[PDB]
Design a protein around this ligand. Structure first.
Ligand SMILES: Cc1cc2nc3c(=O)[nH]c(=O)nc-3n(C[C@H](O)[C@H](O)[C@H](O)COP(=O)(O)OP(=O)(O)OC[C@H]3O[C@@H](n4cnc5c(N)ncnc54)[C@H](O)[C@@H]3O)c2cc1C
Ligand SMILES: Cc1cc2nc3c(=O)[nH]c(=O)nc-3n(C[C@H](O)[C@H](O)[C@H](O)COP(=O)(O)OP(=O)(O)OC[C@H]3O[C@@H](n4cnc5c(N)ncnc54)[C@H](O)[C@@H]3O)c2cc1C
Lengths: 263, 262
């Protein structure tokens, strides 16, 4: 299958085709969308990550959610540039200085944060919870479910809770705006702005929006039997579980409907 | 201090000066000794490790390697086992990199790691040592021996060294040299496991210490030896178990135990 087709011991040589800032001028973040030519060789399902090996020339690979769908020729990835005290993270500094037409080395696929195979036929309902770059897997989910290029056979309902610093920090804004305008009876997006660079504070703002919208959120999960996806900083996970645990019956059978990709 | 002078964020570009197979025909793994030109820029004490960043090219991910050279040498050195695994053979990440490395290739180092150092009073105080090694665990001790013997250090060194077989003793030449040059001050006990199982190898080292438990404990306790343990993780507790049994083992003794296992 797709998992570990390429590893650090046989990474895939790829090429940077494009590199676009994803944020607008009032964002405190530097985040780049990378479009990557893999010559059709990198196999993935929506929700998978790829690994990038910084500075490689023919763990150690940093994982990035793939934001493109399968039937796109190139793959895409959204990468936040981490800084401290000037000084960059290991992969962050590499991605910062990367240029179009540069080589990049990939491993993968990695992860199990995928759609159910039933999804488009079963018209599965979804809750997608995201913070920061945690939106990327959902971008690929949407591109798949609504056959991006109204080619959609999918008539399920999707609710997105997306927490970012501010409006200018919303990643893939144009794509989110597109799906919402094209499919206004299938998609509901709730932006939460924290105005805090601290991820643990952002996740509390998301938990707090969900609490404010608990009747929506909890009927979606307990009544309409949505699949619940959580992606982003590790602090949201237990905060979303607390909401489920404190407000209604919550057993291992309901836990089967909770999918988590945190970091 | 010299710790983290170079990191993965800013590695030191260095050159391979030599690459020498340290093992003999009956050893089932390659082990390469690397002489590395760092332009005098890499700073370290004996016992320190350097990190190598496999496949790096200038625009937990670096593997650590004990430096086997002393400060006073111009180039640094390192001994690197080439790890194989089956399922057609594959190589470890850094192992495959080191395997293919040529003389004059670039190599990027990260910058003194660890606390596996000699006490700085060692030469003036004539400190006695117990060095326990398996496999590549010998490397820091080769650097120790190079430092201690400058020479008027008259301490007493005991070395326990477990390897697969005689063709697998790393730095055999250096060990034999030091043992023969200072025959009253260096005592080496070798153990061959004859099994390609790292856990077996450390069992046999423990077994050789058990045979000599009285000598061993009387060296550590009465001659106040600094005890060093280096190599595969499995030796750690097997040696600790010997310091537990037939011994009170207080915490002024634990000041005298140094561990670098992996
Ligand atoms: C499953 C999964 C999916 C992921 N998906 C994405 C994604 O889609 N997009 C994305 O951008 N990231 C994603 N990540 C995280 C991504 O891998 C990060 O870029 C990586 O984890 C951090 O990268 P780095 O090498 O640049 O930072 P590192 O060098 O590994 O450091 C980690 C953090 O510590 C900080 N740090 C490093 N040194 C210091 C210092 N000494 N003092 C203070 N702070 C320091 C860095 O700034 C950084 O924030 C994902 C992670 C996982 C596990
Ligand atoms: C403080 C310290 C000092 C050290 N000093 C030395 C030293 O002086 N000399 C030295 O040689 N080493 C030393 N090491 C260990 C050194 O870092 C090794 O080269 C390294 O840890 C093994 O690296 P690798 O990249 O080749 O293998 P990796 O790929 O990182 O390690 C995996 C191990 O499992 C095996 N493996 C990998 N993938 C698989 C798989 N899919 N299935 C089954 N098996 C697999 C590999 O063969 C290898 O043995 C030290 C380590 C530490 C922490």
């Amino acid at each position: 299958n797709f998992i570990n087709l390429y590893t650090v011991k046989n990474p895939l040589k790829c090429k940077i085709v494009d590199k676009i800032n994803l944020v607008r001028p009032n964002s405190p973040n530097e985040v780049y969308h990378l479009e990557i030519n893999h010559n059709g060789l990198f196999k993935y399902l929506e929700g998978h990550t790829c690994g990038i090996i910084p500075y490689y020339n023919e763990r150690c690979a940093r994982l990035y959610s793939i934001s493109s769908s399968n039937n796109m020729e190139n793959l895409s990835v959204a990468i936040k540039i981490h800084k401290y005290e000037t000084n960059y993270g290991y992969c962050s500094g590499f991605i910062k200085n990367l240029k179009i037409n540069d080589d990049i080395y990939l491993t993968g696929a990695h992860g199990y944060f995928n759609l159910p195979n039933d999804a488009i036929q079963k018209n599965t309902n979804f809750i997608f919870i995201a913070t920061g770059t945690g939106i990327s897997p959902y971008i690929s989910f949407l591109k798949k479910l609504f056959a991006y290029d109204r080619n959609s056979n999918y008539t399920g309902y999707i609710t997105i809770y997306y927490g970012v610093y501010n409006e200018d920090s919303i990643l893939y804004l144009n794509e989110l705006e597109y799906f919402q305008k094209m499919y206004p009876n299938n998609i509901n997006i709730h932006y939460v702005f924290s105005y805090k660079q601290n991820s643990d504070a952002t996740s509390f703002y998301v938990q707090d929006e969900i609490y404010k919208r608990k009747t929506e959120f909890l009927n979606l999960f307990n009544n309409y039997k949505c699949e619940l996806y959580i992606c982003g900083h590790k602090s949201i996970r237990y905060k979303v579980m607390d909401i489920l645990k404190s407000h209604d019956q919550f057993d291992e059978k309901k836990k089967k409907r909770v999918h988590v990709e945190v970091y």
